[PDB]
Enzyme design. Structure first.
Site, mmCIF file in Angstrom:
data_model
loop_
_atom_site.group_PDB
_atom_site.id
_atom_site.type_symbol
_atom_site.label_atom_id
_atom_site.label_comp_id
_atom_site.label_asym_id
_atom_site.label_seq_id
_atom_site.Cartn_x
_atom_site.Cartn_y
_atom_site.Cartn_z
ATOM 1 N N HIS A 130 -12.575 9.566 2.942
ATOM 2 C CA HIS A 130 -13.517 9.112 3.990
ATOM 3 C C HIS A 130 -14.260 10.198 4.758
ATOM 4 O O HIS A 130 -15.292 9.915 5.333
ATOM 5 C CB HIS A 130 -12.808 8.246 5.015
ATOM 6 C CG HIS A 130 -12.258 6.979 4.455
ATOM 7 N ND1 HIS A 130 -13.008 6.112 3.695
ATOM 8 C CD2 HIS A 130 -11.027 6.430 4.544
ATOM 9 C CE1 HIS A 130 -12.259 5.083 3.341
ATOM 10 N NE2 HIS A 130 -11.053 5.253 3.844
ATOM 11 N N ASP A 165 -8.123 3.600 -4.637
ATOM 12 C CA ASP A 165 -7.647 3.228 -3.303
ATOM 13 C C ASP A 165 -8.214 1.874 -2.935
ATOM 14 O O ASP A 165 -9.269 1.463 -3.419
ATOM 15 C CB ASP A 165 -8.095 4.271 -2.267
ATOM 16 C CG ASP A 165 -7.376 4.167 -0.940
ATOM 17 O OD1 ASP A 165 -6.566 5.073 -0.661
ATOM 18 O OD2 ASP A 165 -7.663 3.223 -0.164
ATOM 19 N N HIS A 167 -9.427 1.138 -0.124
ATOM 20 C CA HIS A 167 -10.641 1.378 0.635
ATOM 21 C C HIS A 167 -11.757 2.006 -0.193
ATOM 22 O O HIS A 167 -11.524 2.708 -1.191
ATOM 23 C CB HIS A 167 -10.331 2.228 1.862
ATOM 24 C CG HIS A 167 -9.362 1.574 2.794
ATOM 25 N ND1 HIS A 167 -8.002 1.539 2.556
ATOM 26 C CD2 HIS A 167 -9.562 0.891 3.942
ATOM 27 C CE1 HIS A 167 -7.418 0.851 3.514
ATOM 28 N NE2 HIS A 167 -8.338 0.475 4.382
ATOM 29 N N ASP A 254 -2.206 2.096 -1.373
ATOM 30 C CA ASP A 254 -2.401 0.945 -0.469
ATOM 31 C C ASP A 254 -2.917 -0.336 -1.131
ATOM 32 O O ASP A 254 -3.082 -1.342 -0.463
ATOM 33 C CB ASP A 254 -3.249 1.306 0.774
ATOM 34 C CG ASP A 254 -4.550 2.002 0.436
ATOM 35 O OD1 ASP A 254 -4.982 1.967 -0.733
ATOM 36 O OD2 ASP A 254 -5.124 2.609 1.360
ATOM 37 N N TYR A 293 0.906 3.124 2.559
ATOM 38 C CA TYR A 293 1.564 3.069 3.863
ATOM 39 C C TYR A 293 2.916 2.359 3.884
ATOM 40 O O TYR A 293 3.612 2.419 4.882
ATOM 41 C CB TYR A 293 0.575 2.490 4.877
ATOM 42 C CG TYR A 293 -0.725 3.258 4.830
ATOM 43 C CD1 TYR A 293 -0.776 4.577 5.269
ATOM 44 C CD2 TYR A 293 -1.885 2.695 4.296
ATOM 45 C CE1 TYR A 293 -1.952 5.324 5.191
ATOM 46 C CE2 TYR A 293 -3.064 3.432 4.227
ATOM 47 C CZ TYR A 293 -3.084 4.770 4.677
ATOM 48 O OH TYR A 293 -4.221 5.576 4.638
HETATM 49 C C1 M7Y Z 1 -4.730 5.294 10.466
HETATM 50 C C2 M7Y Z 1 -4.467 4.503 9.166
HETATM 51 C C3 M7Y Z 1 -4.771 5.436 7.993
HETATM 52 C C4 M7Y Z 1 -3.024 4.002 9.037
HETATM 53 N N1 M7Y Z 1 -3.125 2.540 8.971
HETATM 54 C C5 M7Y Z 1 -1.907 1.731 8.811
HETATM 55 C C6 M7Y Z 1 -1.033 1.847 10.081
HETATM 56 C C7 M7Y Z 1 -0.378 0.458 10.255
HETATM 57 C C8 M7Y Z 1 -0.694 -0.316 8.949
HETATM 58 C C9 M7Y Z 1 -2.106 0.210 8.607
HETATM 59 C C10 M7Y Z 1 -4.417 2.186 9.021
HETATM 60 O O1 M7Y Z 1 -4.848 1.049 8.973
HETATM 61 N N2 M7Y Z 1 -5.232 3.243 9.118
HETATM 62 C C11 M7Y Z 1 -6.610 3.228 9.136
HETATM 63 C C12 M7Y Z 1 -7.187 3.156 10.389
HETATM 64 C C13 M7Y Z 1 -8.548 3.173 10.553
HETATM 65 C C14 M7Y Z 1 -9.357 3.275 9.444
HETATM 66 C C15 M7Y Z 1 -8.806 3.361 8.180
HETATM 67 C C16 M7Y Z 1 -7.413 3.364 7.957
HETATM 68 C C17 M7Y Z 1 -6.985 3.423 6.510
HETATM 69 C C18 M7Y Z 1 -7.561 4.282 5.599
HETATM 70 C C19 M7Y Z 1 -7.234 4.319 4.165
HETATM 71 O O2 M7Y Z 1 -6.430 3.586 3.597
HETATM 72 N N3 M7Y Z 1 -7.867 5.172 3.347
HETATM 73 O O3 M7Y Z 1 -7.541 5.117 1.961
HETATM 74 K K K Z 2 -11.575 2.627 -3.820
HETATM 75 ZN ZN ZN Z 3 -6.954 3.211 1.674
#
Ligand code: M7Y
Ligand code: K
Ligand code: ZN
Ligand code: K
Length: 367
Positions: A130, A165, A167, A254, A293
């Site tokens: 990102h 991924d 995302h 993820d 995660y």
């Molecule tokens: C900060 C984390 C990365 C952690 N997280 C977990 C914690 C609880 C369960 C989800 C998120 O949702 N996050 C995010 C927050 C804002 C934007 C994006 C992501 C994920 C990015 C990604 O997957 N890139 O491949």
């Molecule tokens: K992707």
């Molecule tokens: Zn992701």
């Protein structure tokens, strides 16, 4: 012949102290070691990226700020919001060193591939897809994937980025949206409000890079069989049209069943098929991690995938090792799909696959 595995104990300890994935790097390496897979790989200590190296993509302004914030804290820098350091990306201490390390590992891995040291090079602690040239985003402080791609470009004329991924690999796509020398392919969830909001199928790139971005929007609950059909379909068309000379492959876990993101319903088997399909091309290939995660599931996945790179079948029973108790209650490597429905309607998928087929015609016909 033998794949490079980018690793040092310092590098892991540094990656272990990343917020939201605490001790994940350790867990992943720990489980790889416990299946004895490191024995069959060339272990390379990663370099640290120099400022010059990181400045190949990132602006001097951004790297300098990131550095300042890393030594002190956030409280005397309200300049931080401008460079993407909010709740999404904490302005915590040490983060510049983590960035330089991660970017270094990916650069090192790309270097190994240029030199002819291997056909496959692995850095599971990378995949920060990102990050933008002057802005952190989605817990990515530095786009290691982009840095690797720019290193590979010294030897390889055309490069394919494939992002599995959950995302949208937006940072990487954005960095090469105006060029045809790098093709970006991302499969991701696309839904109102779901991060980062980008990557609909009509996202094709701009200027000289029009049709040299590919985006497959997928809805919740997809499973191995359907995902691989989609993936193989798209990658077949891409290989024919783009004829890449090297590959960077982001394998964020993820997507895996039991992830907190709770969107796709994949198992590592399914992703393995996609990996296998890329490996049969016999091109220079840089392997990266990313999201993931549910930490145990993320280690199960990336360990299993190291297996497929090596061509080994791993045993179902999880070996005893440092983090054995995290693999409870069943203590096996296999992941079971959740009982959630597959929201992907087959008509909508067929329209998506055809649209992409057509976009990739324009790559051939304008060669
Ligand atoms: C900060 C984390 C990365 C952690 N997280 C977990 C914690 C609880 C369960 C989800 C998120 O949702 N996050 C995010 C927050 C804002 C934007 C994006 C992501 C994920 C990015 C990604 O997957 N890139 O491949
Ligand atoms: K992707
Ligand atoms: Zn992701
Ligand atoms: K491109």
């Amino acid at each position: 012949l033998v794949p490079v595995y980018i690793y040092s104990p310092e590098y892991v300890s540094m990656c272990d102290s990343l917020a939201k994935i605490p001790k994940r790097a350790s867990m992943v390496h720990s489980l790889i070691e416990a299946y004895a897979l490191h024995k069959q790989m060339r272990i390379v200590k990663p370099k640290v990226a120099s400022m010059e190296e990181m400045a190949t993509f990132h602006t001097d302004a951004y790297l300098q700020h990131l550095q300042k914030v890393s030594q002190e804290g956030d409280d005397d820098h309200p300049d931080s919001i401008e460079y993407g350091l909010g709740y999404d990306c904490p302005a915590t201490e040490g983060i510049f060193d983590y960035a330089a390390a991660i970017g270094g590992a990916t650069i090192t891995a790309a270097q190994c591939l240029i030199d002819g040291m291997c056909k496959v090079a692995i850095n599971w602690s990378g995949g920060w897809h990102h990050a933008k040239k002057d802005e952190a985003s989605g817990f990515c402080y530095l786009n290691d994937a982009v840095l690797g791609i720019l290193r590979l470009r010294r030897k390889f004329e055309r490069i394919l980025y494939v992002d599995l991924d959950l995302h949208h690999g937006d940072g990487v796509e954005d960095a090469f949206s105006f060029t045809s020398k790098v093709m970006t392919v991302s499969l991701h969830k696309f839904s109102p409000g779901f991060f980062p909001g980008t990557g609909d199928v009509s996202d094709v790139g701009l200027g000289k890079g029009r049709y040299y971005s590919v985006n497959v929007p997928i809805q919740d609950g997809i499973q191995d069989e359907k995902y691989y059909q989609i993936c193989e379909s798209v990658l077949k068309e891409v290989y024919q049209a783009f004829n890449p000379k090297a590959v960077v492959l982001q394998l964020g876990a993820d997507t895996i069943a039991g992830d907190p993101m709770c969107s796709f319903n994949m198992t590592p088997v399914g992703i393995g098929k996609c990996l296998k399909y890329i490996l049969q091309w016999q091109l220079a290939t840089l392997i990266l991690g990313g999201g993931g995660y549910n930490l145990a599931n993320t280690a199960r996945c990336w360990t299993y995938l190291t297996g497929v790179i090596l061509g080994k079948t791993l045993s179902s029973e999880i070996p005893d090792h440092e983090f054995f108790t995290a693999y409870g209650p069943d203590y096996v490597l296999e992941i079971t799909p959740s009982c959630r429905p597959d929201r992907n309607e087959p008509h909508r998928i067929q329209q998506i696959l055809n649209y992409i087929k057509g976009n990739l015609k324009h790559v051939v016909i304008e060669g």
